Putative 6-phospho-beta-galactobiosidase
Amino acid sequence: RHLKPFPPEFLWGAASAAYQVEGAWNEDGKGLSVWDVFAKQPGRTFKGTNGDVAVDHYHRYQEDVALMAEMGLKAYRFSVSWSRVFPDGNGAVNEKGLDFYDRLIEELRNHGIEPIVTLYHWDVPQALMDAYGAWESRRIIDDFDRYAVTLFQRFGDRVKYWVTLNQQNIFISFGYRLGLHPPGVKDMKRMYEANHIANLANAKVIQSFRHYVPDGKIGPSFAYSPMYPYDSRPENVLAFENAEEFQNHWWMDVYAWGMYPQAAWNYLESQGLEPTVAPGDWELLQAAKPDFMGVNYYQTTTVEHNPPDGVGTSSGIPGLFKTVRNPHVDTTNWDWAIDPVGLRIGLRRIANRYQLPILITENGLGEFDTLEPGDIVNDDYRIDYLRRHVQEIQRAITDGVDVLGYCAWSFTDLLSWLNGYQKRYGFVYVNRDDESEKDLRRIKKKSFYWYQRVIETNGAEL
Amino acid sequence: RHLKPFPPEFLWGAASAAYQVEGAWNEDGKGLSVWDVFAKQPGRTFKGTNGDVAVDHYHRYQEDVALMAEMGLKAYRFSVSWSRVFPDGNGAVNEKGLDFYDRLIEELRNHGIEPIVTLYHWDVPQALMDAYGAWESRRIIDDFDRYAVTLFQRFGDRVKYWVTLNQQNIFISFGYRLGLHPPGVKDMKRMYEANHIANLANAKVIQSFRHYVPDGKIGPSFAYSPMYPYDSRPENVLAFENAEEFQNHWWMDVYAWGMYPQAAWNYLESQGLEPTVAPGDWELLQAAKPDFMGVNYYQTTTVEHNPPDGVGTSSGIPGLFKTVRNPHVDTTNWDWAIDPVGLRIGLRRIANRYQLPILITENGLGEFDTLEPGDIVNDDYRIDYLRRHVQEIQRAITDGVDVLGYCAWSFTDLLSWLNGYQKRYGFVYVNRDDESEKDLRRIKKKSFYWYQRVIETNGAEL
């Protein structure tokens, strides 16, 4: 057993999200997104940081793409801001907004970089929330489809790889169960209704894609934390079965097969939480097969048995499972797990269950970076993290998983949703902080040159 | 939470296998099976025990069925001895052989017991082995199909439930990898070829069944030991992924989906062990969907990481996994785990992966029963084992698994393949041992009356 090489056209990539990078929040006719409004609620974000300017990629995209070309990136995954294209969500298309993405795509294409367009990264126009509650209304299905079709028509000739909803499980759960993200709701019944509507929207746009981009490849991207049982106690293995189905299959089985898993469905039904199903829903969900599963990966989760009066720090569902710290994985300086083998396990699970190729749409290390004199940022810790994950991807490929590419999170430093700028993810440091924009200058970190060498050798030198 | 009741037509059953019970090995024109010949090789079986007489069910079937009716069995699962029906495997049908099964089916029906006919329990006629190597030749596909169709034509009007191959993973692995069962070969390449041919034979007969028994239900039965990781060490979870796929999905994915899992396939191909595929193979395997998955269950298996220089007591595959004792389950007197929750886990896994109904075709406890004065057998240990498993089945039904029935192994004591008679499995003790058949009298054990009560109450007291 020697390791297989990465395939010749492997998409070595890096990624961002529109609200986190663009700025220009009110320029060129752009409408308000739910995040523009949410982040301006006092106390919501660290030091009141928000996306008004972010790292100003909207104005600095030429420099950023030039840096991507210097690195030799094979692919750049970005999201399109719906509120730039339809400021009111529906209604009139904004040609200024589409023209930004056209210029970005042209810059990428002129440097030989594959664009990977992500339709949705959490920024539905505020006008749709006001009009009908956004993801809680079936009205969004057609509005999202009209938006996606517009993008397919404008860019399908130049963009082969598309992601639909990015981390639906996050925007739905954080928005409707934990109340951390818009709309700030804590209501499981509403969460599962909005989730079902998002599932229908995903399926509808994949159907549209088959018409407008017949040679393209499309898929949703799932924030995947593979579950582990704590030990071989039967009750803990059963907790693992419950958790993997409830947290992971609940989304990925719908994406791949168009069907919710039955044990989870029956539990939700027993709680009065299962979504409302309309005639035609199952037919639509089953008729929208993706070309790949997108995977956003940071860590695994370990679970154990949870008595019916137990946990609802540990989280879980009474009678089904609760989380427990895994003593067998490392942690970051923020006490989150580092588990590169877990990425191999997740890739293996997706191939084994769904036989789908996988695009890793997000993986990276957030850490304080120190800017040293001479514009030097020594981030060996980020190189170590990325190296270990890429090594495990190579082992998954050797096992037989079809991995289409790997998008490191992120290309440049970016604004986090709630925590400001100090925990940085980029290959490229952006000189700004939570207090001021400074000069917004871009500074290549050591990891930039490391990844440049990874790409040059197609992953042979890590 | 309220447990669901066992469904109104739940098949409370018990089971046997032809070679293990019938005797009459050379009567009424029956041809030699591979087991008739194999068990007579010196040293092959304990004390030279063999199936010449076994417990003489061929002559005593009326008494045995009368005991089943006294117990109130809803179903009796038995296997048909191919060599009674086609003494040479192909060629001329033997009407006396069919007449035995006709009389057995009529006896069951007259007592209100549902027959569950198992086509194949390891006893291919020796003439097919002599002519072409039995399961190593594609010739067996049509010969097995002709045998199955004969049974469908004669009995399809009276038998709704059919099992095709019973525990293919055992007869193939023991016959061609471990050399413990006929033909006594130890050659992994030959094992995987014979296994592929058995897969095609299974699919072919299910296809034929659709033509001849339009209201029937058919499926294969898999000897399922669900795998557990030892703990939440990533390498042990990975070992579990490898083990569940290689040991379990390798068979059940072919049965349910008509496809071998890719990581296991690629491992075999790297060893030069993958089977030879002919045009039409995938089409046939994919077009023969079963109505249920049959499950033979005794215990789970716990696994841990196994370096490429490791185990090949513990067993495993270097670089994939190795077994390890599970400290969290009880054990039988033969180091078998007792893990009723593991049965719930296995049922949940089959429902979650394949959405198939499940017929539990075999589950039971083997122990050295003592015949006490007054013809009393106090087998409280067997009652305890069965009770715990039936309770876990009810929990699986409550979770949403469609369990069609439960066949306790076995109805009467029977001959084991290699280990004689002393480790007994029956509800009904048979007075014989390894040295002689004694008088073969049938004696109800305490567990007989326990299960009688379970059936009478439809499980409602457990």
Q: What stands out?
A: Chain B has one domain: 1-462. Residues 348 and 399 of chain B are 8 Å apart (CA to CA). The first helix of chain B runs from residue 18 to 21.
